[PDB]
Amino acid sequence: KVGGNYNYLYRLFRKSNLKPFERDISTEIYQAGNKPCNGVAGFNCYFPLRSYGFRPTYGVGHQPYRVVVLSFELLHAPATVCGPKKSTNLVKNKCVNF
């Protein structure tokens, strides 16, 4: 938006790296110094989440890009999901391959 779309947030500081396919929604104050700050915002007490503020006048590298990931895995299942197979007509009075 023209006024800035600050609805999308991202985590910038964390204690350690995330595992594959891990989701963490914790908003605890990141301890960057020596004391845990007792859960307040201050020097060496930074908030993990940061906003984007997308604007239409930004560059190509800064425009928002909706990214979707399609995770696929096979666990020796009956494979219930399957795409479309085929669709043909019905031949009559003639030997064909069905």
Binding site: L12, A32, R50, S51, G53, T57, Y58, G59, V60, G61
Partner: protein, 595 residues
């Protein structure tokens, strides 16, 4: 966690918060310059103090780092540009007093109006009328009165304010572990923390003096040539072996000698190379100029502009319905947003200026992958140097005839080359002695080598020896000549115009070798040179993350500033001046005076 981990964490948050707020201030400033309305002024004011207060509160929190345990050169250079306290070291009374002096100097310089005894209601301000007389009027007594009356009304009023301006700036810099306020300006070129590429602040003074020793032989023959031609235009006032007056340089301050081309023209029978009439015949406009200019940059090996450039930037004035600044300025809002504000007309001057503004954008897009604290050039002269080598490469006769401006049935001659080199010398090398003496004089004022009762005496003494300009009338000590300049009264560094001039020829000489040039330096064209653009892009991409000494070696290959490429550019002009400056005594006598 060590102190280095806390510094990197502080910078990661600061870079995210700065780019968001700096874009809002740049966008608010863009709306003000593109449309002068009360709504846009308020948007610039509130966003101005918001960014000013943000930079102050973040700098205060950055002072909690000793900076001596950190060994990372990238983290150290960013904190040095952020932990700088500035004028906040002094007390509350000295802070408001210094800001008050800086405010009244700009108002007096802008709203300064000198009255004339010819008519009580015929007073004119600085920019309109006054500069027209100093440039086009040929009367001796007319431009002499206008030159002295301006400094008589502005210098006498700024002299009591300038005496307090020096003592306040000296005590502010000394509190920041410096020697004087003049050393604070020279601190930009300071390089420390990396062996093999260091550069002390005191070495800059020795560098300018050593390089100026070779500019004098080129300037002495240039000053003697202009003096010989002005004898016919201003007779019975110029001495054959004496200096030149200050009101005959073509400007109020004598910075540029562009106005002297109409009087000191070598060959006035043939006009200069102008493509103004060639553009109106082909139905060109502002859009065609930037398209032809973009084709030049992509031929050297630079990427194309972003999509928002041709859509958001206003390259044509819509008329008298949306007021905008007619001055060409490169706008880098950030986050991939690059705009250019310029009222581009159908004129050859706007064609060369278009490449100047477009060259600065190519520089800004190079270091776009750098942090905000390093999102700048190597120094205050590296930015303007890249923007001017593009205009000189585009002003060549071979480039003009290749794009369709010059007719193919036109071959350059020796007379056109001499007029081209001499015209450029009036604005490129002609301002070097003026810039040299102005900086060296102020450097001694802030340091204390010149007493308060000898400001005007040492100013004219250096003008006679370095530039070779004699004062027309005796001036009392109450006057103040340096305060008459815009860059001096508004607290602006003027040494950036000297280093950029020398760096301009260093880059031109470094690109002609890669382009396989076979002629003079002024005929070189960096067009269609992929190896020249790739070598230049490696330096522009670094920006401020690397010292200027290391960046200069990537293109030029020299670790120290060099003035030799400057002499090679005007080498054909030097041989032509020495052949003509043989009928009179070369040089000037400082003992002579017109009074």
């Amino acid at each position: 966690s060590t102190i280095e981990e806390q510094a990197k964490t502080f910078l990661d948050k600061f870079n995210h918060e700065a780019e968001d707020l700096f874009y809002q201030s740049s966008l608010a400033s863009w709306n003000y310059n593109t449309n002068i309305t009360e709504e846009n002024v308020q948007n610039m004011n509130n966003a101005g103090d918001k960014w000013s207060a943000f930079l102050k509160e973040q700098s205060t929190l950055a002072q909690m780092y000793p900076l001596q345990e950190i060994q990372n050169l990238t983290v150290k250079l960013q904190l040095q540009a952020l932990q700088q306290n500035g004028s906040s070291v002094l007390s509350e009374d000295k802070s408001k007093r210094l800001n008050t002096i800086l405010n009244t100097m700009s108002t007096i310089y802008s709203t300064g109006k000198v009255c004339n005894p010819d008519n009580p209601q015929e007073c004119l301000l600085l920019e309109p009328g006054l500069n027209e007389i100093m440039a086009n009027s040929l009367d001796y007594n007319e431009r002499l009165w206008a030159w002295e009356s301006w400094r008589s009304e502005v210098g006498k009023q700024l002299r009591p304010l300038y005496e307090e301006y020096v003592v306040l700036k000296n005590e502010m810099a000394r509190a920041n572990h410096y020697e004087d306020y003049g050393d604070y300006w020279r601190g930009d070129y300071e390089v420390n923390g990396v062996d093999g590429y260091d550069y002390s602040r005191g070495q800059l003074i020795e560098d300018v003096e050593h390089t100026f020793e070779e500019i004098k032989p080129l300037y002495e023959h240039l000053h003697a040539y202009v003096r010989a031609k002005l004898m016919n235009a201003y007779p019975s006032y110029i001495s054959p072996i004496g200096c030149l007056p200050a009101h005959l340089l073509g400007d109020m301050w004598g910075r540029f000698w562009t106005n002297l081309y109409s009087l000191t023209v070598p060959f006035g029978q043939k006009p200069n190379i102008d493509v103004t009439d060639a553009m109106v015949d082909q139905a060109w406009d502002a859009q065609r100029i930037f398209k032809e200019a973009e084709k030049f940059f992509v031929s050297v090996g630079l990427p194309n502009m972003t999509q928002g450039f041709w859509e958001n930037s206003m390259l044509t004035d819509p008329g008298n319905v949306q007021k905008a600044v007619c001055h060409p300025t490169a706008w880098d809002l950030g986050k991939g947003d690059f705009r250019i504000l310029m009222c581009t007309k159908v004129t050859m001057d706007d064609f060369l200026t278009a490449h100047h503004e477009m060259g600065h954008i190519q520089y800004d897009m190079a270091y776009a992958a750098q942090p905000f604290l390093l999102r700048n050039g190597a120094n205050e002269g590296f930015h303007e140097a890249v923007g001017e080598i593009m205009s000189l490469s585009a002003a060549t006769p071979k480039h003009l005839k290749s794009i369709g401006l010059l007719s193919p049935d036109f071959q350059e001659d020796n007379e056109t080359e001499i007029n081209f080199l001499l015209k450029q010398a009036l604005t490129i090398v002609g301002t070097l002695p003026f810039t040299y003496m102005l900086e060296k004089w102020r450097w001694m004022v802030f340091k204390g080598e010149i007493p308060k009762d000898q400001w005007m005496k040492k100013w004219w003494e250096m003008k006679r020896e370095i530039v070779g300009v004699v004062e027309p009338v005796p001036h009392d000590e109450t006057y103040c000549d340096p305060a008459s300049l815009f860059h001096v009264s508004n607290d602006y560094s003027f040494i950036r115009y000297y280093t950029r001039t020398l760096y301009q020829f260093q880059f031109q000489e470094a690109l002609c070798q890669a382009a396989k040039h076979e002629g003079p330096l002024h005929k070189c064209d960096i067009s269609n040179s992929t190896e020249a653009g790739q070598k230049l892009f490696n330096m522009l991409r670094l920006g401020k993350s690397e010292p200027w000494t290391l960046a200069l070696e990537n293109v030029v290959g020299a670790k120290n500033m060099n003035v030799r490429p400057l002499l090679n550019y005007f080498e054909p002009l030097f041989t032509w001046l020495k052949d003509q400056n043989k009928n009179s005594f070369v040089g000037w006598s400082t003992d002579w005076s017109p009074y």
